[PDB]
Design a binder for this molecule. Structure first.
Ligand SMILES: CCCC(=O)Nc1n[nH]c2cc(Cl)c(-c3ccccc3)cc12
Length: 290
């Protein structure tokens, strides 16, 4: 775009190239996303009004010479990079708590306007020096469905996918985002991915090896689902003290409610914020190197 001066290529998205740019009129540093129907245009235009402190601001939507440009607020780092830098020491519990609290606040706002992300991962989670965390790419999965591969042919991660999506459920609810956040929560505490599957079936069998193979008792309607097979191996449920040590009981209780099989019984973002785990939340600042 003409009104912007590119500074450098800052990454590869699901849909297109992400650049760090500067506006020639305002002088403001921005994140410029470039992609490549009329309904997809309407969907993204509505997101310019989904404003909250824990959601990455969609500053503008530009459709020119038959290509999509998305102007976002700039944040210096993502959670994936922070987790790798903090891998040998771990992220301190007060910081893990604050990030989850703030993420749950972002989700609660969006789910109240009937908007879901559908593809949460540490990569699309952005952090700053003031101790804040924000959700990036929110609502883009409704506009264009999640592909198998990115524009660069890179494999789209299955690690954070909810079990209802993997079983062939056509009508996804907001409970899908609560699952992904729960998986990210466990990863922050553990310093290792919860379910790092490398195929849809590997992902599904990894969930089952830990949480137990679901049945009509725990999940009413699971056996009637599109991709469910009665030939599925029957694994028993693992404890939880083995799943996320050395995390306390309040943390184990909250994670358990976020990882429930039945989407209807899985805790909402609003209810999670009322959990006694957040009794002593604070807002600490991390030691960011930029
Ligand atoms: C992680 C440090 C560089 C970076 O991505 N900065 C961002 N600033 N604002 C952004 C807004 C967005 Cl939307 C995405 C971004 C994140 C995931 C996938 C595609 C794009 C990234 C940034």
């Amino acid at each position: 775009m003409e009104n912007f001066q590119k500074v450098e290529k800052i990454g590869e998205g699901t849909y297109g190239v992400v650049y760090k740019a500067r506006n020639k009129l305002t002088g403001e540093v921005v994140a410029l996303k470039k992609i490549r129907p009329s309904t997809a245009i309407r969907e993204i235009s509505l997101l310019k009004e989904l404003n909250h402190p824990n959601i990455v601001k969609l500053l503008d939507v530009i459709h020119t010479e038959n290509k999509l440009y998305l102007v976002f607020e700039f944040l210096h780092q993502d959670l994936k990079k922070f987790m790798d830098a903090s891998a040998l020491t771990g992220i301190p519990l007060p910081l893990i708590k604050s990030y989850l609290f703030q993420l749950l606040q972002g989700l609660a706002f969006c789910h109240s306007h009937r908007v879901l992300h559908r593809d949460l991962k540490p990569q699309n989670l952005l952090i700053n020096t003031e101790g804040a965390i924000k959700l990036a790419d929110f609502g883009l999965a409704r506009a264009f469905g999640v592909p198998v591969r990115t524009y660069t042919h890179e494999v789209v991660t299955l690690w954070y996918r909810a079990p209802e999506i993997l079983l062939g459920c056509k009508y996804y609810s907001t409970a899908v985002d609560i699952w992904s956040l729960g998986c990210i929560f466990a990863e922050m505490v553990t310093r290792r991915a919860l379910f790092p599957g490398d195929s849809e079936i590997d992902q599904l069998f990894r969930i089952f090896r830990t949480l137990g193979t679901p049945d009509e008792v725990v999940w009413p309607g699971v056996t009637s689902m599109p991709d469910y097979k009665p030939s599925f191996p029957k694994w028993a449920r693992q404890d939880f003290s083995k799943v996320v040590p050395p995390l306390d009981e309040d943390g184990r209780s909250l994670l358990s409610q976020m990882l429930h099989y039945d989407p209807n019984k899985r805790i909402s973002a609003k209810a999670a914020l009322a959990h006694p785990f957040f009794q002593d939340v604070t807002k600490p600042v991390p030691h960011l190197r930029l």
